[PDB]
Design a protein around this ligand. Structure first.
Ligand SMILES: [Cl-]
Ligand SMILES: [Cl-]
Lengths: 226, 226
């Protein structure tokens, strides 16, 4: 059975995780894990309560690891237990993946050094200090690393992983069973397509978070420099 | 504060719910409820454990009600307590909405009689016996009713509801903050675009469920005829 694991942490952006979870859990011969320091309730940034199913110590070797993003990424970038777990699993995983600001956690773990990668548009400047080659594309692959932008990045890349773990017909069948054919009613999902006034509002609302994450990123980079 | 409620039931398809939940929970001056017979753990069809936050009796009057789909829809179509709650809330709600097979629950509650509506492609034949005018479109509006197809229907229609409850700039800002710009790697999300061999596989896998739901639908229709 293919072993797929998602890191589940306080103040996660739950859709980053729950989207790919439902897609991948639809495949045959997969087992999906929700990993934290111990099993039990973990609260997402919206207040939605999720349950972790396994601890770091009990998690099996994973074929796919996925790091979601969210407010809670700042704490995780300086959590030595979580970073060590990610490094251990990434060494043997077939696919190391992240959604949105989850790539900043991969960066803090040292896994983006010399690698092409993306992250959420408002935090993209934080990739270079973590050793990455920043790329402004929605899905960036470098070897077995796959970083994606957008809250639903993992739904799309889950279909790619289904096709590569199984076959194209299997991925197509899952897509049809889920009737997955998005059609957003607005075209403001990128700073290059949204109105300038909207981009300003969004940048202003992210400013305090970006400032705090600049500080965290520099400490994380210092640890990598040692 | 705008009151938004999702019905959370055993064997729900969790993404039908968790997608719109995360989008709508990003708006100012909203309160989002996860409703079941009592607060506490409810298990989705994938095994993911979610928590209901309020009971039927304690739920406030809702401005928006949303019914997700999933395996568990069959039981809900013959749950008199759930159907009565949906009818009570729908009487005064500004928006009555559903995702995928959630519209079959609205049908069992009598809320599709004479109304245009859609549902999941494999179960679409069940709409007419519940009194609906079946429409093969991804999002169908009829008055204050909005039914949508696809596991992520609620992400898209949540942006429409944001624009109508607040304004377009607010919906655009949420879309940009979430960097929401999907791009599926396959084009098999409709029976009209998927390969015929894939459609066959998917139809064969749904056949037992469709058979059971034909029986349930006829009993539900008999109750509406009384
Ligand atoms: Cl997206
Ligand atoms: Cl969809």
């Amino acid at each position: 059975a293919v072993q797929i694991g998602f890191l589940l942490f306080p103040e996660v952006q739950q859709l980053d995780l729950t989207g790919p979870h439902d897609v991948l859990a639809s495949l045959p011969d997969v087992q999906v894990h929700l990993i934290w320091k111990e099993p039990g309730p973990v609260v997402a940034s919206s207040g939605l309560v999720l349950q972790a199913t396994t601890s770091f110590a009990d998690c099996p070797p994973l074929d796919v690891i996925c790091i979601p993003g969210g407010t809670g990424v700042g704490a995780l970038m300086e959590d030595p237990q979580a970073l060590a777990f990610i490094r251990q699993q990434a060494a043997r995983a077939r696919y190391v993946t992240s959604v949105c600001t989850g790539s900043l956690v991969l960066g803090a773990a040292g896994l983006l050094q010399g690698k092409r990668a993306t992250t959420h548009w408002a935090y993209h400047e934080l990739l270079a200090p973590l050793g990455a080659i920043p790329v402004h594309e929605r899905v960036v692959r470098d070897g077995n690393l796959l970083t994606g932008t957008g809250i639903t990045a993992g739904i799309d890349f889950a279909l790619t992983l289904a096709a590569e773990l199984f076959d194209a017909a299997t991925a197509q069948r899952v897509q049809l069973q889920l009737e997955y054919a998005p059609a957003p009613p607005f075209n403001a999902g990128s700073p290059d397509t949204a109105p300038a006034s909207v981009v300003q509002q969004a940048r202003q609302r992210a400013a305090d978070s970006l400032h705090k994450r600049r500080e965290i990123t520099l400490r994380a980079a210092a640890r990598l420099a040692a």
